[PDB]
Design a protein around this nucleic acid. Structure first.
Lengths: 151, 65, 112, 65
RNA sequence: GCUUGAGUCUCGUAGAGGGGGGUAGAAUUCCAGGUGUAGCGGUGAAAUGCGUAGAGAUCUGGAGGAAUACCGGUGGCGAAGGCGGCCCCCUGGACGAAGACUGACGCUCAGGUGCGAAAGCGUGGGGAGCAAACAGGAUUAGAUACCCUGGUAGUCCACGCCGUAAACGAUGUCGACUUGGAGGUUGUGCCCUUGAGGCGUGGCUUCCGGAGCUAACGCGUUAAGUCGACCGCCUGGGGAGUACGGCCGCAAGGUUAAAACUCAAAUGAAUUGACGGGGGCCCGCACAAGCGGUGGAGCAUGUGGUUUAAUUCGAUGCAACGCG
């Protein structure tokens, strides 16, 4: 807020093998608060991803996120006059959460059969970085590299 | 105005310009001679300077610090 | 194209425009480009990035002449005069010296 | 405070350009009296000697020629 | 007759003091020449205007023109207005040390005389950049204004006219006395220059404050304190610093200067609320990021308005509209 310097809260780890980042991926999937359905969809999508790729559940999801991981992002910081976008490096806690948000936002569209199949197909397309969330990343990168001279 | 800043430089470092010429005599003559107001702003600037000097001469107080 | 060895990059920075124009030692120009031909129609003309892209589009279309190093001759007031010369560094040129070749009036009157 | 003209008998002349060069900068401009002493009588005589040496091309007006 | 008033001479000091004659440095403009390209110009944004004839711009050469960024300082000079490279000539005024001379020649001034910011007027010239008036383009319900692009008088030299300014430290000129501090500037005496210092005496000037004064703010040893000499102005506001008359001026106009009529107010610095498209600091999902809605469709409810003989009454900008 304005003065409050409170930090992030400590969420519960996932009831599968211990990884808090995929628990945050469970947390940002969640329509209508339905956490149990979100955990079932994440679990089934990680099994159908580890089956089609041959990797584990913690390392196929590891290299699915660095292809949707943005480098810098733009935000409006005007200083006395004209309003221009400012490219800046994002903090990693915001970075990986926004990348998972991009994965889920790409998973909301492109409806093949069901939500677990959509999430597995989005992670499979982010494996060889030709899907939709990597296009969101390349669009955020196109917002930079030409408006980069303002610093 | 003139500097060489020899070959292992990779940067301008032209601090001699802004000390003398670059702004203080440049963005004052593009408009508004004013015909009097240089004398008025010189009066106001030296008044502010002598009041700041008289305040710094009397700045020694308690001040709770 | 004459295969000239060096040149002199005269830069005119103003509140109007920021040109970069490269002549030889004897003072006939070898190719140049404007900050207005480089895009930015209208309000973004008086930005230093317009001077940067003017120096960028001056850096090319002169490779037939083959200029290695250059002298920098700034001229005029304005928001430029300091940001475009770094565009003369990243584009593959060697700066010799930065000078100015203009006097003030030798008895002249300036309005508002 | 360390002026060479305050105890400086045989007042500052235009011919001796070795000591007269120390009161101009690199761009030929006159060094102010707010930096190097040079009380106002000897400062005005110094400015006269500077510009009468600039007239005789003993010291440059500037490096813009 | 005398000298402490005033004045003159001797030795010097500082100054943008004035007048005349010349020489020179941080860049928009015009012309010519080489170059080479797609737009230039401003604003919150936009256009007029300039441009493929090749613009704004690139270097060189030339042309003229009224003027001094740095030094530069509530720093200095001049009675005031005002005056700011430098060189040459003329010339005034101010101040300091030891003296020498006249002996009240001294202060103020109605009338009168001279100087007098800028704007303007007349003649002979210059005209580069701006710039009233004027044109075009933007904003607005309207804009003949604030904004922009051009542009004439003028801003400018020689000689006159006009004599007006918020010509204001709003404080008339001269003399005397009156605690003080911090300074700036300019001389001089003395001390060991024994080391960029120390102790005093004169002029001008800035700020703060003692007594005192003032309606207050504030002035405060250059007083608005206490006095003495003289000149000018006022008896409420509007009318009105207007009209008539006299004088000056080529004109614009200026000086002097009423009356009739209306009102019981006008005004004066200062304090407290309000406000500033005034700042500094702080706060609230107030703004930034994000989520879900309204306004696009249909149903429940209320209001405005219409009709009726009634469509009971109140609330009716946030602070009324699923309210009573």
């Amino acid at each position: 807020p304005r003065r409050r310097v409170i930090g992030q809260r400590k969420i519960l780890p996932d009831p599968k093998f211990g990884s808090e980042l995929l628990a945050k991926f469970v947390n940002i999937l969640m329509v209508d608060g339905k956490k149990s359905t979100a955990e079932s969809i994440v679990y089934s999508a990680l099994e159908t991803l580890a089956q089609r790729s041959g990797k584990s559940e913690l390392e196929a999801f590891e290299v699915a996120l660095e292809n949707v991981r943005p480098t810098v992002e733009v935000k409006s910081r005007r200083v006395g006059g004209s309003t221009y976008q400012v490219p800046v490096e994002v903090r990693p806690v915001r970075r990986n959460a926004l990348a998972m948000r991009w994965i889920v936002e790409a998973a909301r569209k492109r409806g093949d059969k069901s939500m677990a199949l959509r999430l597995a197909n989005e992670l499979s397309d982010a494996a060889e970085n030709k899907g939709t969330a990597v296009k969101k990343r390349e669009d955020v990168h196109r917002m930079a590299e030409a408006n980069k001279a303002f610093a | 105005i003139k500097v060489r800043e020899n070959e292992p430089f990779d940067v301008a470092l032209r601090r001699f310009k802004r000390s003398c010429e670059k702004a203080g005599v440049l963005a004052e003559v593009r408009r508004r001679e004013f015909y009097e107001k240089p004398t008025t702003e010189r009066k106001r600037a030296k008044a502010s300077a002598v009041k700041r000097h008289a305040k710094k001469l009397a700045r020694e107080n308690a001040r709770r610090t | 194209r004459k295969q000239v060895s060096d040149g002199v990059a005269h830069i005119h920075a103003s509140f109007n425009n920021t040109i970069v124009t490269i002549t030889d030692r004897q003072g006939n120009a070898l190719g140049w480009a404007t900050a207005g031909g480089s895009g930015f129609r209208g309000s973004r003309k008086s930005t230093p990035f317009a001077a940067q892209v003017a120096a960028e589009r001056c850096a090319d279309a002169v490779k037939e002449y083959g200029i290695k190093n250059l002298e920098v001759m700034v001229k005029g007031p304005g928001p430029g005069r300091e940001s475009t010369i770094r565009a003369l560094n990243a584009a593959g040129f060697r700066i010799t010296n930065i000078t100015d070749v203009t006097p003030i009036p030798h008895n002249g009157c300036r309005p508002p | 405070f360390c002026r060479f003209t305050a105890e400086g008998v045989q007042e500052i002349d235009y011919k001796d350009i070795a000591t007269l060069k120390n009161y101009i900068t690199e761009s030929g401009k006159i060094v102010p009296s707010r930096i190097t002493g040079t009380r106002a009588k000897y400062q005005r005589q110094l400015a006269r000697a500077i510009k009468r040496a600039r007239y005789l091309s003993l010291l440059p007006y500037t490096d813009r020629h």
